[PDB]
């Protein structure tokens, strides 16, 4: 029983010591799949614009 690690605002709790990383449910996996889908769609669009030989200029990021 080693002393536990008190997370703080400037010392976040590691994913390894996350009590929720070891309590997984089918819906959590579904949400992870959805997030991966979102990231994949965004990365696809960005790379499509980024590898275009015709493009000349900045790739306007709406998020920025």
């Amino acid at each position: 029983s080693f002393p536990k690690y008190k997370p703080s605002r400037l010392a976040t709790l590691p994913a390894t010591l996350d009590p929720a990383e070891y309590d997984i449910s089918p819906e959590t996996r579904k949400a992870q799949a959805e997030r991966l889908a979102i990231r994949s769609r965004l990365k696809r669009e960005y790379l499509l614009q980024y590898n275009d030989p015709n493009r000349l200029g900045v790739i306007e990021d709406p998020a920025l």
Partner: protein
């Protein structure tokens, strides 16, 4: 001239074997011509989330309503034609399907159990019919006061935790449930490592194992897309839920404190303590002369129609307390006497009552494990919870180790100065406010 110890030694021993898929096949063999073979599944409401709560009850309802191999009438016809009795019970932590049948009919019973567990049709028309039936059964279960007060106890004690959910589930979930949700529940929770095939009576362990290899082998423990349900410890919250309905004739109150898990060794001394507290109903003949002080006072003053002490244990937490039905104007007195008995056991328990409690526990253990159905139930539940069927000799040794010092220690740990969880139903106005109830949990003298 066999002695109790010799009789325990002569008890047939449970043999546990595991199929490669993870199904555990367990058997206790007796000379009886009748056998009870059942599949115990480690699935229940505690493994269900909010939206799919009650799916286990739905699946239990429609499991005997047909399979892909044999349609709905066919399963019932086979079971009745061989004379077998097919029954299922679903709890917050366990779900089981067991068949009482003749020993010569073991192969067919195993086939039917495998078909029910694996190849369940879940047909949509039957789904709608069972939906209607389950809504009606919820309305009926509203009438059963004991079940309601225990559900309230679980809701208030384990609030914010899956254990709070009822086995049947909210009516809204029942009407919103679909075939996809039931299929997903079966796929997620009915897995070979989480299932136990248990039998009792005239069953040969080799034959049972071979039948299991023949039929249950296809069932697999792999989770689709590695979506593995993860067990969650449940927090115990000291709370009070009062459904004040003065129209009801008698008041039901259930008060409990957090208890040990299934595997915790302190269960045995606590069971001895509860046996010391005892149980009373108005129909008991013993009355005033009954050893239990609470029972004696209740009989003398007609305080309560019935009072019983319960030790409900789950994997990591449990509800330890008592449930008593009493008149509207006797609730406060009965609560006072119950808490007084709790504190007396905690502080000044004596050897004689400890011996009485141990003897009562021994008799309950030996008497309950009588017949193929209870023996098979104990085998399955013990494999699921303890990971092993604790032999009666081990139970006797653990009971014998209990002494007054042990009872005082464990009762002080679990009952003294601990916030209780209280659920009340009916004319419960005289039920003391929670501050008074908590104050009763400790003695200013001690």
């Amino acid at each position: 001239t066999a002695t109790y110890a010799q009789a325990l030694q002569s008890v047939p021993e449970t043999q546990v074997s595991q199929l490669d898929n993870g199904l555990r096949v367990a058997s206790e063999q007796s000379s009886q011509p009748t056998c009870t073979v059942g599949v115990w599944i480690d699935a229940g409401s505690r493994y269900e989330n909010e939206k799919n709560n009650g799916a286990g009850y739905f699946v239990e309802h429609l499991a005997f309503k047909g399979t892909k191999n044999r349609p709905g009438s066919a399963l019932e016809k086979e079971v009745e034609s061989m004379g077998a009795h097919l029954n299922a019970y679903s709890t917050r932590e366990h779900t089981a399907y067991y068949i009482k049948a003749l020993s010569k009919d073991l192969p067919k019973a195993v086939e039917l159990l495998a078909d029910i567990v694996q190849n369940c049709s879940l047909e949509d028309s039957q789904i709608e019919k069972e939906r209607d039936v389950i809504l009606q059964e919820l309305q009926e279960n509203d009438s059963s006061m004991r079940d309601v007060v225990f559900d309230y106890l679980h809701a208030t004690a384990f609030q914010g935790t899956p254990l709070a959910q009822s086995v049947e589930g909210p009516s809204e979930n029942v009407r919103k449930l679909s075939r996809a949700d039931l299929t997903e529940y079966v796929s997620q929770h009915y897995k070979a490592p989480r299932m136990v095939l248990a039998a009792a009576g005239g069953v040969e362990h080799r034959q049972l194992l071979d039948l299991a290899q023949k039929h249950f082998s296809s069932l697999s423990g792999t989770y689709v897309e590695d979506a593995v349900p993860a067990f969650t410890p449940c927090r115990f919250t000291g709370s009070e839920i009062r459904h004040r309905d003065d129209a009801l004739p008698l008041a039901h109150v259930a008060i409990a404190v957090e208890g040990p898990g299934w595997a915790n060794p302190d269960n045995v001394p606590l069971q001895v303590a509860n046996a010391i507290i005892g149980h009373y109903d108005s129909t008991y003949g013993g009355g005033t002369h009954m050893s239990s002080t609470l029972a004696s006072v209740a009989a003398t003053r007609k305080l309560c129609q019935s009072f019983q002490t319960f030790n409900i244990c789950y994997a990591e937490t449990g509800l330890l307390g008592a449930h008593f039905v009493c008149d509207n104007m006797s609730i406060d007195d009965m609560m006072f006497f119950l808490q007084g008995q709790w504190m007396r056991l905690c502080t000044s328990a004596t050897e004689s009552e400890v011996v009485r409690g141990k003897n009562i526990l021994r008799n309950a253990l030996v008497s309950h494990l009588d017949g193929t159905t209870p023996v098979c139930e104990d085998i399955g539940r013990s494999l699921l919870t303890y990971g092993r069927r604790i032999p009666l000799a081990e139970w006797e040794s653990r009971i014998a180790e209990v002494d007054a010092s042990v009872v005082r220690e464990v009762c002080s740990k679990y009952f003294y100065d601990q916030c209780p969880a209280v659920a009340g139903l009916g004319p419960i106005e005289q039920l003391p406010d929670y501050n008074r109830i908590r104050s009763g949990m400790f003695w200013l003298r001690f």
